[PDB]
Design a protein around this ligand. Sequence first.
Ligand SMILES: CC(=O)N[C@@H]1[C@@H](O)[C@H](O[C@@H]2O[C@H](CO)[C@@H](O)[C@H](O)[C@H]2NC(C)=O)[C@@H](CO)O[C@H]1O
Ligand SMILES: CC(=O)N[C@@H]1[C@@H](O)[C@H](O)[C@@H](CO)O[C@H]1O
Length: 368
Amino acid sequence: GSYRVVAYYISWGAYGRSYFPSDIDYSKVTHINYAFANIKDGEVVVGDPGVDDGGKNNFTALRKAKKAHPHLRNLISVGGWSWSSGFSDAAATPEARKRFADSAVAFIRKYGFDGVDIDWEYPVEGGAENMKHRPEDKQNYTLLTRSLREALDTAGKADGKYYELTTAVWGNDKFIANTEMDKVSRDFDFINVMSYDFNGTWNKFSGHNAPFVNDPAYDKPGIGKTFNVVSAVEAYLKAGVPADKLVVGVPLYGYSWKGCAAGERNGEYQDCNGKGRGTWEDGNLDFTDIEKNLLNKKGFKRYWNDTAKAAYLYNAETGEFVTYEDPQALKIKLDYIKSKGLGGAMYWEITADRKQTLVNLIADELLT
Ligand SMILES: CC(=O)N[C@@H]1[C@@H](O)[C@H](O[C@@H]2O[C@H](CO)[C@@H](O)[C@H](O)[C@H]2NC(C)=O)[C@@H](CO)O[C@H]1O
Ligand SMILES: CC(=O)N[C@@H]1[C@@H](O)[C@H](O)[C@@H](CO)O[C@H]1O
């Protein structure tokens, strides 16, 4: 088939969530991205020895899945939001790039992965409080990608297999200004656009995690008119990412605020009073939790914004507002993938939808 389905699996699923690689329906994906490997002393390293290469042994479980499902490709995701602070150094010199690339080859060979996903958040500007940047990141992301592609090509030749190289990219078009997407696109097998986290409880006002198109009714400070899926996809296409390599990110979680004023919009784009109820932490809901507990339940009502093409919940009693991925929005995005000839769908993350409501819709629309 023409489309990828790239599911993130979180290593920490193997703690209180009690969701292990054995729980994944491998018929519903083409790829698993394993979140995450860390960077230590310029090398890719095991993120969590309690569940990765030992203890609950998620890596053993992913190899078991590969043997049962020969179609499957498993990629190690390096870095992410919390663990990106090592990239700028790793990318900055030819010696550091070779050390990094060689450590990535060593990792996928030892643990049985089919390639490497680079989640550098983000070159030049942006990222967590611990994040490190330098202006040279714009060219060094290209050089690190080339070093990885060369190392994985050489290793694949030695091993009689093909290793993929991918990346997660910001939904914010600053990422495009701070990288050379026309160059790196040639070396990545595909590029997962994180077309989500456009709004969240970092804002004291409500908004949509993943609105499809711009809604001019949303006018809050610093919120770009490009903070939507179509704007992000069109920006990466314009920057030179080939359509067939551009994979559209979808969230399987939601965000919540409490004490949102109703205004004229049942709590949408309103000033709120902090995080709302969550599943495993305040303000963050699994789709499973929304579906079972909140979807037209417990005083929450579902609303549809036909400008943004996004659903939300509002509880008028508590003022709680939930942004989440409704099937009505996700169907529009799956049709858009097909109409644009895109590379498929990616989602964060597979444990957050236990009934596979969104998982199954994605697989039904994109897979054979
Ligand atoms: C449109 C935009 O710039 N949104 C920012 C968010 O991207 C950012 O959230 C972070 O987004 C990453 C994906 O690009 C996630 O990997 C990361 O987990 C997420 N960070 C947090 C703390 O949720 C938020 C918050 O930093 O800021 C927005 O401005
Ligand atoms: C709980 C958690 O860590 N989730 C974040 C999430 O904000 C984001 O959607 C994703 C980007 O792929 O990165 C994850 O690490």
